[PDB]
Write a protein that binds this DNA or RNA. Structure first.
Ligand SMILES: [Mg+2]
Ligand SMILES: [Mg+2]
Ligand SMILES: [Mg+2]
Ligand SMILES: [Mg+2]
Ligand SMILES: [Mg+2]
Ligand SMILES: [Mg+2]
Ligand SMILES: [Mg+2]
Ligand SMILES: [Mg+2]
Ligand SMILES: [Mg+2]
Ligand SMILES: [Mg+2]
Ligand SMILES: [Mg+2]
Ligand SMILES: [Mg+2]
Ligand SMILES: [Mg+2]
Ligand SMILES: [Mg+2]
Ligand SMILES: [Mg+2]
Ligand SMILES: [Mg+2]
Ligand SMILES: [Mg+2]
Ligand SMILES: [Mg+2]
Ligand SMILES: [Mg+2]
Ligand SMILES: [Mg+2]
Ligand SMILES: [Mg+2]
Ligand SMILES: [Mg+2]
Ligand SMILES: [Mg+2]
Ligand SMILES: [Mg+2]
Ligand SMILES: [Mg+2]
Ligand SMILES: [Mg+2]
Ligand SMILES: [Mg+2]
Ligand SMILES: [Mg+2]
Ligand SMILES: [Mg+2]
Ligand SMILES: [Mg+2]
Ligand SMILES: [Mg+2]
Ligand SMILES: [Mg+2]
Ligand SMILES: [Mg+2]
Ligand SMILES: [Mg+2]
Ligand SMILES: [Mg+2]
Ligand SMILES: [Mg+2]
Ligand SMILES: [Mg+2]
Ligand SMILES: [Mg+2]
Ligand SMILES: [Mg+2]
Ligand SMILES: [Mg+2]
Ligand SMILES: [Mg+2]
Ligand SMILES: [Mg+2]
Ligand SMILES: [Mg+2]
Ligand SMILES: [Mg+2]
Ligand SMILES: [Mg+2]
Ligand SMILES: [Mg+2]
Ligand SMILES: [Mg+2]
Ligand SMILES: [Mg+2]
Lengths: 77, 41
RNA sequence: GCUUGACUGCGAGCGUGACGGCGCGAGCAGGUGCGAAAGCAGGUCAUAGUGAUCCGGUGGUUCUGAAUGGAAGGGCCAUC
RNA sequence: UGAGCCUUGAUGUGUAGGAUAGGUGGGAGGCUUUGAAGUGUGGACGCCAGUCUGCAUGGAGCCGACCUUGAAAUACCACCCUUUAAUGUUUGAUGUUCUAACGUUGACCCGUAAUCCGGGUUGCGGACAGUGUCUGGUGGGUAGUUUGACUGGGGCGGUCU
RNA sequence: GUUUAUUAAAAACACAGCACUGUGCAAACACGAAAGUGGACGUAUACGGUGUGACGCCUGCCCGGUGCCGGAAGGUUAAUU
RNA sequence: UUUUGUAUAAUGGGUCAGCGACUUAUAUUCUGUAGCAAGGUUAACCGAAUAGGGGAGCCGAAGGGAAACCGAGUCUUAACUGGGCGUUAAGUUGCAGGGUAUAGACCCGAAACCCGGUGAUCUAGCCAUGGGCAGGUUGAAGGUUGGGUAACACUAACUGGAGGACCGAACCGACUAAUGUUGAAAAAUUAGCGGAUGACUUGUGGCUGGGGGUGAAAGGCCAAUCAAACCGGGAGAUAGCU
RNA sequence: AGGGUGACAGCCCCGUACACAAAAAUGCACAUGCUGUGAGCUCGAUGAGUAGGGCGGGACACGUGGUAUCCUGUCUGAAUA
RNA sequence: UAAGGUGAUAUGAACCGUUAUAACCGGCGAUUUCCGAAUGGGGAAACCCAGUGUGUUUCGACACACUAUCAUUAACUGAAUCCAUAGGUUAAUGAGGCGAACCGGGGGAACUGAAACAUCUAAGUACCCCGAGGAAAAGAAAUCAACCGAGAUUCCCCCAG
């Protein structure tokens, strides 16, 4: 589903509030993108469905760390 | 983004220094082909 | 002719309305205009010329102003 | 290619005026030994009057108010104006190449007996396309509703303080 | 030929034919939050939509209004700064 | 019952028997009554538990003002001769009652809206695979042999067997009439009627589902139900109406 | 207490008040051994795509309102005692 | 525990037992066909068809057991490519499914009220989904207070309509 593999972000539900304050249900979706991350530790490419915030987290932390916690969470990449 | 260079990339930088490069440039090109590593120290 | 009573704070007592409200009002206090003065003047000879509340805007007011000092805001008064 | 950054050139002649002036000039010397008057690029501005640039053959005087002007001369003189060279310098935009993101409902190889999928090699496109958030437009495709009262029955007409 | 099973079988609907129009293929368009599927294992002599409705003779004028297509100069114009 | 007005020919009831409609909870006010009385009373809870404790708190004994604040006064205003609101009963806690408020709130009764499911054994369409269409006519293209032609073209006979062709049983329909209309039947029967090798018909299995399907289009059909199916729930929806 | 018994039973019966009862299995309170479990002491560390912000929305009694605080979809982004 | 008993409609028949393995009651075991999560494959539930191994053998044949999927780990294998990796085989452990309410989270209406209706209310209710327990959630201050202090969370009564 539309779940960021790294950050765990998933769609939420809010309202479209018009100018006249009419409220209709809507969904906020994360900005996911299927990206091919390169890992030095294996000499290999790892493809993850990760939002832009998740890619920023990847740059900040490191690909090895994020896979470490992905495996700890048990999700298969 | 800050990258520690590992080569002389004829565009801009010499070996072994931290330089401000575009995040996408570092993520897609520099890091995956040696050349640079992120500035974590 | 001169002028600002087309004043400020009240108001005995009435009239008229289911009510909201609307009208008449001597007299009191302050400060004015006209008149020598008595006196008259808080709009037009009278009855139409208009809209409640909310929400806000502007100017005063240190009345309040969530720990304290301010301020934001709110209130009260004038007003859109 | 458009904002700012040694801009050293930064104009600027309603009125007069050798004399192309907003005013502080450092309110009067600068100046002379980087060389003062054919500047051996020449225009920038040219209302074309002359401010006017390594080129000075001249290697030292043109010259300052002084005279006319509403000031007085930007004489080594600090902020000089709807223009550009500025060392480029940080930057939008546009355009053109690239490939490394990404796309591939191109080909081939493998899991694999499998026109799904994934992995690899490669070709093409390529920062475009596409998706997320925000945002303007369109939107009876869809949805929720509104569409007054009096009234010689209702409508139409008229009226509503 | 079809149609209101169960008051209407028709002049209604369909029809072959005609025209306009969209679509270059990962086609338009439709179902689907998406994957995907139909279109089609088709490809512009094809497919979708709209209208008219064999055949014969034809289909005149109007682009002001409403749409649709094309244009980019100018005016007004959102987020952001 | 409803009405200005009913024997009314206005509504309701065939009759009997049983069931059937102003309730409950909690707040607030008024009345009656009981206790205490400038006091009254406890709530949760603790408890050998209808006792006792618990006074947290609530109401009242003081009002005026928007408020600071003042205080039997206060507010207005510069200030009242003033004027408004106040100042000389007694409240409070139970119990019973009459109202009000929130709840389905006196009972029955909608058409509708939303949510989750069940339905394509009928019918609509499509997909796959099988089957049916007695009998008799008409006579296209084509071919052959001749005539003909420069060769065609064209022409005659023979042959040929096309067609959303013709007549007509099965099969499919449903145009007219009569019957029936508490029927034999919740759409049939009798006599005629239309198609009947096709855009036909039919058996079996499958697929499409409710703002959705499917529709040679009637708002038709979607299990005798369709301008939005059925079942369960929101739900005792709401009903200024009967 | 109650129920039955040919009508209404303290003394007819079954029960009740009370007194006892478990070979086996079990829950519970506590204890003892045990298996991997670990105290205390000194010195350091002391939670970063994070707080906060921009845009949208929601929850806070609080409907954007002068609106604090929390949670976030998107874009950013510290100090670290 | 016992002098009665073989459940009931349901009488009968044939019997068992009397002082103790009749019957009855309780604890623990034994058996527990088929379907059903159903688990070897399949299926129109209570049915059809197998594979492997072991053991019975007069060929016929019979019996027993295992054989699902997912996750976790381990072992052994093993592509495109060298190494690896993906994948494959085997074994061990765990899960699934059901259940009345309560509980936490993911979504989430409308009728209704407003005397119409759209902000709002109804209501985060109904309903759907997921997860867990005997309770769950919360919970040990980046909290309140007001410069006096309190001291995690939960629940009841006031505060307080
Ligand atoms: Mg709503
Ligand atoms: Mg007059
Ligand atoms: Mg303060
Ligand atoms: Mg203020
Ligand atoms: Mg509509
Ligand atoms: Mg409504
Ligand atoms: Mg009317
Ligand atoms: Mg009218
Ligand atoms: Mg009919
Ligand atoms: Mg008919
Ligand atoms: Mg027509
Ligand atoms: Mg025409
Ligand atoms: Mg036109
Ligand atoms: Mg035109
Ligand atoms: Mg246009
Ligand atoms: Mg009448
Ligand atoms: Mg009579
Ligand atoms: Mg009669
Ligand atoms: Mg009668
Ligand atoms: Mg009646
Ligand atoms: Mg009757
Ligand atoms: Mg009452
Ligand atoms: Mg009701
Ligand atoms: Mg079905
Ligand atoms: Mg025949
Ligand atoms: Mg025929
Ligand atoms: Mg028919
Ligand atoms: Mg007949
Ligand atoms: Mg016939
Ligand atoms: Mg015919
Ligand atoms: Mg016929
Ligand atoms: Mg058929
Ligand atoms: Mg439904
Ligand atoms: Mg019609
Ligand atoms: Mg029907
Ligand atoms: Mg409807
Ligand atoms: Mg309800
Ligand atoms: Mg219901
Ligand atoms: Mg009802
Ligand atoms: Mg008796
Ligand atoms: Mg934040
Ligand atoms: Mg943030
Ligand atoms: Mg903020
Ligand atoms: Mg089985
Ligand atoms: Mg099975
Ligand atoms: Mg509503
Ligand atoms: Mg309403
Ligand atoms: Mg109403």
């Amino acid at each position: 589903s539309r779940v960021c593999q790294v950050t765990g972000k998933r769609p939420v539900t809010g309202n479209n509030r018009s100018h006249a304050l009419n409220a209709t249900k809507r969904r906020f979706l994360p900005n996911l993108h299927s990206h091919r991350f390169w890992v030095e530790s294996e000499k290999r490419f790892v493809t993850l469905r990760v939002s832009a915030k998740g890619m920023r987290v990847i740059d900040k932390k490191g690909i090895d760390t994020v896979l470490a916690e992905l495996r700890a969470r048990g999700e298969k990449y | 983004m800050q990258v520690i260079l590992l080569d002389k990339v004829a565009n801009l930088g010499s070996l072994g220094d931290q330089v401000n490069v575009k995040a996408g440039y570092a993520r897609n090109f520099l890091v995956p082909q040696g050349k640079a590593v992120p500035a974590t120290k």
